[PDB]
Amino acid sequence: SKCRQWQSKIRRTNPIFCIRRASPT
Numbered sequence: 001s002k003c004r005q006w007q008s009k010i011r012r013t014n015p016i017f018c019i020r021r022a023s024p025t
Contacts, residue, residue: 015022
């Protein structure tokens, strides 16, 4: 599902873009 996964992605991308400290690769 596009809509749900986009909403979940926004909430992930927020901290991952605002800080670079946490990078679990």
